[PDB]
Symmetry: C3
Subunit: 400 residues, 3 copies
Amino acid sequence: IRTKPHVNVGTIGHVDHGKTTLTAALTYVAAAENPNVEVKDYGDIDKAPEERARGITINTAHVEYETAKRHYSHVDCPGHADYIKNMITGAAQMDGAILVVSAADGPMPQTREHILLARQVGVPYIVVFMNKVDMVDDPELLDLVEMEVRDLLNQYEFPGDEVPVIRGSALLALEEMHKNPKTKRGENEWVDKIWELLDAIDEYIPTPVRDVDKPFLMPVEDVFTITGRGTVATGRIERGKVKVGDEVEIVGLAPETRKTVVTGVEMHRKTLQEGIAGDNVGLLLRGVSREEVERGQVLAKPGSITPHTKFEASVYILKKEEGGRHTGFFTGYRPQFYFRTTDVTGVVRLPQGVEMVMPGDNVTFTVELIKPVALEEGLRFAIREGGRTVGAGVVTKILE
Amino acid sequence: IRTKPHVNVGTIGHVDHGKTTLTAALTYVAAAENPNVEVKDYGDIDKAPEERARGITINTAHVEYETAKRHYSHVDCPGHADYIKNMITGAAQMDGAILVVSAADGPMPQTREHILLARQVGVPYIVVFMNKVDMVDDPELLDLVEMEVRDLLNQYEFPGDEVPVIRGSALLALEEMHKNPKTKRGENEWVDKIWELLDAIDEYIPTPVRDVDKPFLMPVEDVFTITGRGTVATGRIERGKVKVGDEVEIVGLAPETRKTVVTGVEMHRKTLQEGIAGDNVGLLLRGVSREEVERGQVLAKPGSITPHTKFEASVYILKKEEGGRHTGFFTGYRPQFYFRTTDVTGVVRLPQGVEMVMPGDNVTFTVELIKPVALEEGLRFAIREGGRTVGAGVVTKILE
Amino acid sequence: IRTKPHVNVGTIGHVDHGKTTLTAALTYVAAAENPNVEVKDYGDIDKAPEERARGITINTAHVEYETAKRHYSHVDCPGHADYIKNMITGAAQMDGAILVVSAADGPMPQTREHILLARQVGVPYIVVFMNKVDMVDDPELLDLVEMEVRDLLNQYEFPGDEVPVIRGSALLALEEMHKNPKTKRGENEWVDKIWELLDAIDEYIPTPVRDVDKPFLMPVEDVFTITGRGTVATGRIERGKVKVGDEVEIVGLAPETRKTVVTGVEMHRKTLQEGIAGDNVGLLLRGVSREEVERGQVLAKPGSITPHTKFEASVYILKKEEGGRHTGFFTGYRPQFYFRTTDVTGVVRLPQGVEMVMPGDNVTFTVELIKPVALEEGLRFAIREGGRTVGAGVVTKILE
RNA sequence: GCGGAUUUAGCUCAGUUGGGAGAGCGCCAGACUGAAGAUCUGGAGGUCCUGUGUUCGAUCCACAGAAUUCGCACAC
RNA sequence: GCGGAUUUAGCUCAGUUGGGAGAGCGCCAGACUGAAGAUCUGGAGGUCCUGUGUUCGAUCCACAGAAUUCGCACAC
RNA sequence: GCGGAUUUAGCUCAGUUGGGAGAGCGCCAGACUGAAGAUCUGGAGGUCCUGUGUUCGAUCCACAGAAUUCGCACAC
Ligand SMILES: CC/C=C/[C@@H](OC(N)=O)[C@@H](Cl)[C@H](O)CC(=O)[C@@H](O)[C@H](O)[C@H](C)/C(Cl)=C/C=C/C=C(C)/C=C/C=C/C(=O)O[C@@H]1C[C@@H](C(=O)O)CC[C@@H]1O
Ligand SMILES: CC/C=C/[C@@H](OC(N)=O)[C@@H](Cl)[C@H](O)CC(=O)[C@@H](O)[C@H](O)[C@H](C)/C(Cl)=C/C=C/C=C(C)/C=C/C=C/C(=O)O[C@@H]1C[C@@H](C(=O)O)CC[C@@H]1O
Ligand SMILES: CC/C=C/[C@@H](OC(N)=O)[C@@H](Cl)[C@H](O)CC(=O)[C@@H](O)[C@H](O)[C@H](C)/C(Cl)=C/C=C/C=C(C)/C=C/C=C/C(=O)O[C@@H]1C[C@@H](C(=O)O)CC[C@@H]1O
Ligand SMILES: Nc1nc2c(ncn2[C@@H]2O[C@H](COP(=O)(O)OP(=O)(O)NP(=O)(O)O)[C@@H](O)[C@H]2O)c(=O)[nH]1
Ligand SMILES: Nc1nc2c(ncn2[C@@H]2O[C@H](COP(=O)(O)OP(=O)(O)NP(=O)(O)O)[C@@H](O)[C@H]2O)c(=O)[nH]1
Ligand SMILES: Nc1nc2c(ncn2[C@@H]2O[C@H](COP(=O)(O)OP(=O)(O)NP(=O)(O)O)[C@@H](O)[C@H]2O)c(=O)[nH]1
Ligand SMILES: [Mg+2]
Ligand SMILES: [Mg+2]
Ligand SMILES: [Mg+2]
C-alpha cells in the first residue's frame, strides 16, 4: 500500500538495558497518530515461549513505524552474549541505529561488543538513548554517563561527541502510551524524550537510497508455513522488486536453484503490488514449503547471479587492535564467511605465494565454501571465526 | 461370530493311513448337528490338482468343527516323507493331536518320525485312533497293534500306556455321514468310534489358554489374492487381536516393515469383529498384495517386536539318541532356524570360548540369519538341518 | 486406399544435373491424369530453408506417382559430395533407378561415384536420361555424350550399351506441365521425352516382388512430431504390414525395445488399412514422440528379430579395384556398418586365425557395434569407412 | 504350497566316475613401437554358489540352503 | 536431416608446424611434528577422445566415428 | 531461530585428567588341509568428525564448524 520514505534502522545494546522495550515506545508514541502505526507491545515481540520465559530477546525481532516525514524499518536486536549471531545478522539488513544504553549501568560488555560489531559490520550512523533515566536521579551521574559513551563511540571510530545522547525512559513513556493510547507530542514528558530521540533519527540518519534496477534477489531473512497456503520468505530485498506471480528461484544453501512462484507478496502484513528496494518485503511461493527454502539463499528470478563453492577474494584481516585475531593463520583455516543473510564455513587456501597471513595484513587468496552460494565479483563480505570478527574482504573473482 | 472355546489340534501320521479322511468324519459326525459344522468332504481338502492327482496330502490343510463343549481348530498333516516341512509347520500353530495310525499296517517310518517330530516340537498331548479297523478282523492282531503304539509313544517320552487307543474306521463312519447326513451319536457304530475319539479329545487335551494382551502379531501362515479386493493372511495369531481397519505392519522376511490396513478380517469365512488369542483368524490388508506378504513375517501393528539378522541364543543340541546329529560342528555351520511360521538358514558363529559343539552338549552362541526376522529375548526356537532336528534353544539376546 | 503395383525407384546423379527437377516432371507429366498424381513442384521438395538457400538437395526427398500399369515410389537423391550418406540411404530402400545426367556436362565425379555406389549397394537396374538437352544442339555432341555413359555404366558392371539413353529436358517439359497442367502424352515434345523415359521404366525395371509373411519390421527411415497428436515413422517396410492399433516395439539404436501403439497409419498422406510389403508406409504411435524413436531402429511388433551389440559375419572386402581400400587392416578397425536404415561403427576383432585382412580378401570374423541393432543370421550388410565402401558381408551368426 | 532349470576365472563358455577344472576375452609381463594400436612368448587369477553328512580325502555323491529362470497350482 | 563448439594427468586449466605435452590441486615420498594440519625438496601419473589414411614416424594433417554444448530446420 | 544427543580402526563397541586409544569381526600372514571351511600364533590398519585458540605439546580443554538423532518453538 505505497506512500512514504522507507528507511532502515534498529536498537542494539547490552542485554536488559532496553532494546526490546523502547520499541513499543515507537509503535505507540508515533502510533498515537497514523492508523498505520499499530499495536506492537512488549510481550508482543517476545512471542517465543522461551524468550518471555527467560526474560530476554534471543530471537531477532523487527517492528515498523513512521515519524511524519520518513517511514521506518526498525529492528530489535538481542543483547545476550550467547546470541550475537542473530544480533549481527539484523544489523546487516539495516542502516543506522539506536544505541540502547542503560543510564543506570553505564556501558557494558555488549555495549562495546555491539558498537564494535557495528564498527566491524561498517554501520552508517548511531544515536545513543541514555535510558532507564528514572532509575537515575543524581545529575553528576547522568552527565558522568554520557562522557563515557562519547568516550566509547570514539574508541570505535565514531561521531563520538557529535552524536545525540537523547537521555530518556523507555518504560515510563510506554506506560503512558498504554494509559492514553493517543497522547500526542508535547504532552507526556516521557513520550517527549522519545520524539527528541526520533528528532535525532530524522536528524542523524540521512537516507536509505538504493536501486531496484537489477533482478530478483531476496536475502532470505526468514521462513514459515502460513496456514492454508504455501510459505513466505520475509527479507529486505537489496535489488529486485516482486509482482506476485513471478517465476522465481532460490540461489544458495540448497542443492540446485529451486523454482516456484511469487503467488503471495505481502508486506508488513499489508499486501503490496511488487515490493521494492530495501523494503523488508514478504512473499509466498508456489511449490516451495519451508522444506524448500531456509534463511540464507537468494530468491532470485531465473538467471540472477549464480551459486558457487570455490572463488577468489581480496581480504583485509583486522589487526588485534581492531578486535581481530592476534595470531596469523595459514592454509587449512576454516572460518565461516558471512554473506548478508546466512554464514558458511570455507576452507582458506592461501595463494601460491603467501605462507602465513597475519593480523594487520591486507591480502588476497582463495576459499572453498562447505556449501553453495550467490557470488559476484565485488560482492563485499565479512569473516568471523570462533568468538569474533577477523577480517573483511571482497569477491575478487570466482572459480566454480 | 463369537461363542465357544476354540482349542487347537490335528491329525498327524504315516502316509496313507488316514489323516485326511478321518477329517471329514468330524465335519460330519459332529456336523450332524450345529449349522456351524459344515461340508468338509475328502476331495474337498485335497483341492490341489496334483494332491488329488497323486493321491496324497502334500499341502497342509485345516478344517474346523466343534464337539459340544469346546470348539476346535483341527489341522490335517501330510504323511509323505517328502513333505514333513509342511507337516512340521502345522504341528507348530496347534496343540495336542490325533495320531492317525493304520490298524492294518502297524507303526511306520512317519509314525515314528512324526511322533518324534511332535516330541521334538514339544507338542502337549496325543491320542491314537487305531484306524482302518474294518480291514482288520483277527483280534489277536488288534490288541497286538496297540501294544506297539503304547510301546512307541513311550520310546518318545509320552503317556504311552496312559493314552487313548480309540480303535475305529475313518471311512465307514464317513460313508454313513454321507448317506444319512444328520445321523446322531449312539446311531452308527462307526460314527460312534468317532465320538469315543472326541470323548477322548475333550477327555485328553485340557486347554488352549493364552493372552491377547500384547500387540499385533500374526505368524503369517498363508496368503492369496481373493478376487475383487486385496489379499488375506490366515494364521493363528499368538498374541494380538484385529478389529478390521488397524494400520498394520509385516515384520520379517520382507526388506522393510510394510504398512497397510486390516480392511478385511474374516475367520472360517465367517467375519469376526477382531479375532483373538490362538484363533486361526484371517485378514485382508489395504496395499499389500501377495507380492507384499509371504508365509513367515509377523503382521504386527506399528511398533511390535522388531526384525533382526544377528542375535544371541541359549541352545540345547539334542543327542543322537534324541534324533539329533551324531557329529559335533563348529563355526560356519548354516542350519536353517525355525521361527513359528517360516524357517531361515543362519550362520552359527560360536562364542569366543567354545570350539566344537557336540551332540548332547547344551550351550550358548551367536547366529546371523540370511534374512530378517521378529526377535525377542526369550523367543524360544527350533533347529533342523538337512534331514533332521538338531537342537532347540532360546533367543538369549539380540545384536542387530 | 489400395489399388495398383507399388514399385520402388529414384533419381541419382551428379550435383546440379537434374535429379530434383525431373521429379516434378513426373508428378505432372503422368499427373496430367489420375487425381492421385498430385502437386509435387520443384521448390516443393527442397522445402528446407537452407536447401533452397544453397540451391542444392542435401536432404533426401521422395515423391510418388504412377504411370498407367504400375504405381511408383520414386526417391530424389542429393548430388553434392558432402551428402552421399543421405544419397546412399535412399538407394537402399528402393530398387532400380534413373541416372540423372547432364547432357551438357558429360559424366562427372558423382556420376561415377553414384553409379559405383549403386554397383556397390548392388542396385538392380538403371536407365539414363541424358538431360538439359536444350542447352545442347550440336548432334556430334549428343551422340558423343551417350558413348561415355554406356562406356561408364560398363566399367561399373552394368547393361552399359543395353540401357536406355532417353535424351531429354527436365525443365522445358516442366514449364509445360505448368502452363497446361493437363497436357497429355503425344502433346508436348518435351513431355514426350519424359514418357519415353517411363516407357523405359515400365520397360526396364521388372518387379518389386516381396513378402509380408514375417512380423512387424519398419526400417525407420524418418521421424516428426505431427501437430496435435503423437509422431510418425515413415519407412518402406521390408516384411510386416500395419493395421493401426498394433501394440509395437522399436528394435535398435535406443536402449531397450520401446513399446507403443500404431494408432496412426497413414500412407502418402492417404490413410491405408494396414500398409504392406515394400510400401513406403507411415505410422504414428501412442507413447513414442520423436524423443522415443529415431531413423534407424526397426518398428517391430513385440518379438520380431532382436537387438545385438556383438555378432559374427562372412565378409567380402572389395579390392581397391572395386573402390575398396588399398591397405589391409587388422583388429581394432572401427568402420561404421550399414544396416538398411542407419549406420553404426563397430570394432572388428579378427578370428583367432587370420592376422591381416587385405583388399580382395574374402573372409569371416567378429564385430562389436558401438550401439544395439536388429540382427538375423543371413542379414546381409555393407561396410564403409572414411570416404568409401570397403566390403560387403552377411551376419553368419550372433553373439550377444 | 509344489515341480524343472541353471549356478564354475573379471567377461563369455568347457569339463568330470571323489585324488582336487580348461579355452578364448580380457589382465599384467617380456620382445617390437618415441608412444598407441596390431603381433609374438610368457605369467597371474577359480573357496568349481553355500553348509553338513559320508570318505583317508568332496567341484563331483547324499542330505540340507541360496540366487536367477521357465512352469503348477491355490479369507486364493 | 543440417551447422558451430569442445574433447588433453584423478580435478581444474596450458600448450603445438608431425620427432611424440606443462602448470597449479590433488597423489605418494623424504625433512620437520608424538601425530595432524602447515611447509620444504623430490617422485609417479596422460593410449593428447577413437579408427583408418598419408608419413620413415601422427596429440597435431586428411578421411571417417564418438561423447557433451550452443544453434537450423523439418505422416514435421 | 532455540535446546539435548552422538560423532573413535573397513564393521560393531571400549577407553581418558593434554605426553598422543583397545577389544571382538573382519583383513593379510605363518602352521595344519590337495583345497575350503574350522583352529593356532602373529601382523597391518585410527588425521580419536573439522578449524582455530591456549599449551612446550591437543583425542581430551576453550572458542568456533559439520554430519546424523530426539525435542522447542515460530507473511508461522
Ligand atoms: C553479512 C556480511 C556483511 C559484510 C560487510 O558488512 C556490512 N557492511 O554489512 C563487511 Cl564486508 C563490511 O562491508 C566491511 C566494512 O564495512 C569495512 O569498512 C570494515 O568494517 C573496516 C575496514 C573495519 Cl574491519 C574496521 C574496523 C575497525 C575497528 C576498530 C576501530 C576497533 C575497535 C577498537 C577499540 C577497542 O578497544 O576494542 C577492544 C580491544 C581490542 C584489543 O585488545 O586490541 C579487541 C576488541 C575489543 O572490542
Ligand atoms: C517352529 C519353531 C518352534 C520351536 C519350538 O517348538 C514348539 N514347541 O513349537 C521348540 Cl524351540 C520347542 O519349544 C523346544 C521344546 O519343546 C523342548 O522341550 C525340546 O522339544 C526338548 C528339550 C527335546 Cl529336543 C526333546 C527331545 C526328545 C527326544 C526323544 C525322546 C527322542 C526319541 C528317541 C527314540 C528313538 O528311538 O528315536 C529314533 C532313534 C534315534 C537314534 O538312533 O538314537 C534317532 C531318531 C529316531 O527317530
Ligand atoms: C544399407 C545396408 C545395405 C547393404 C547391402 O546393400 C544393398 N544391396 O542394399 C550390401 Cl551387403 C549388398 O547387398 C552387397 C551386394 O549387393 C554385393 O553384390 C556387392 O555389392 C558386390 C559383391 C560388390 Cl561389392 C561389387 C562391386 C563391384 C565394383 C566395381 C565393378 C567397381 C568399379 C570399378 C570401376 C572404376 O574405375 O572405379 C574407380 C577406380 C577405382 C580404382 O582406383 O581401382 C576406385 C573407385 C573408382 O570409382
Ligand atoms: N526503570 C526503568 N526500567 C526499564 C526501562 N525500560 C525498560 N525497563 C525494564 O527492563 C525490562 C527488560 O528490558 P528489555 O527492553 O526487554 O531489554 P532488552 O533490550 O530486550 N535486552 P535482552 O533482550 O537482550 O534481554 C523491562 O520489562 C522493564 O521492566 C526504563 O526506561 N526505566
Ligand atoms: N479300509 C479302510 N480304508 C480307509 C479308511 N480310512 C481311509 N481309508 C482309505 O485310504 C484312502 C487314503 O487315505 P487318506 O486319509 O487320504 O490318507 P492321508 O492320511 O491323507 N495320507 P497322505 O495325505 O500323506 O497321503 C481313503 O480314500 C480310503 O479309501 C478306513 O478306516 N478303512
Ligand atoms: N537447360 C536446362 N536447365 C535445366 C534442366 N533441368 C534442370 N535445369 C536447371 O538446373 C537447376 C537445378 O537442377 P536440380 O534439378 O535442382 O539439380 P539436382 O539434381 O537436384 N542436384 P543437387 O540437388 O545435388 O544440387 C534447375 O532449377 C534448372 O534451372 C534442363 O532440362 N535443361
Ligand atoms: Mg531485545
Ligand atoms: Mg493328509
Ligand atoms: Mg536432388
